[PDB]
Amino acid sequence: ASYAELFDIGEDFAAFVGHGLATEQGAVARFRQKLESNGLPSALTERLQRIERRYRLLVAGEMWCPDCQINLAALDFAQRLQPNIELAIISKGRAEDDLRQRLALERIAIPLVLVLDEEFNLLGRFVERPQAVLDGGWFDITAYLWGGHLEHAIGDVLAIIEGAA
């Protein structure tokens, strides 16, 4: 299926979360509250506000995955603040079946977030975790699992949008 066809059958975040176990919806609620209370740095907030074109994020994720709970709570926050961004979420299994060849991936690590423009051209991708976490060791991964890198998922995605033209 084309990226447009996949984004069409993808679910929105509210629906995605609504299909999760009570425990998993509570994990997402926890990461959401951290952003709602702490907010975001002003430099990042400014970069978000300056996004004036429409971007589509095609995600492969699942509500039982801790990395999806973490990073998608973040990207939902961003999208609710900046509705020029929109997420649609398909399954890991569907990504394994239809996205592995074109993306040149042997396996699908979730969340896989594909950043597309309005004509569904692929601008880049975020895979599993923020790059500052993927460059780190035990310490960074641990703070991340605690929700201390939520702003990095947003920053990474903005970076891909910014990196394009």
Residues that bind a second copy (CB under 8 A): 1, 5, 9, 11, 19-23, 62, 64-65, 91-94, 97-98, 110
Q: Which is nearer to a second copy, 75 or 89 (CB)?
A: 89
Minimum distance from CB of 31 to a second copy (Å)? 19
Amino acid (1-letter code) at residue 150: L
Q: Which is nearer to a second copy, 98 or 136 (CB)?
A: 98
Pseudo-torsion of CA 43, 48, 52, 58, nearest 10°? 150
Q: Which is nearer to a second copy, 19 or 54 (CB)?
A: 19
**How buried is 104 (Cβ within 10 angstroms: 0-12 exposed, 13-18 middle, 19+ buried)?**
exposed
Minimum distance from CB of 28 to a second copy (Å)? 14
Minimum distance from CB of 83 to a second copy (Å)? 23
The secondary element (H helix, E strand) that includes residue 81 is helix 66-81
Cβ 16 vs Cβ 89: under 8 Å = yes
Q: Which is nearer to a second copy, 81 or 105 (CB)?
A: 105
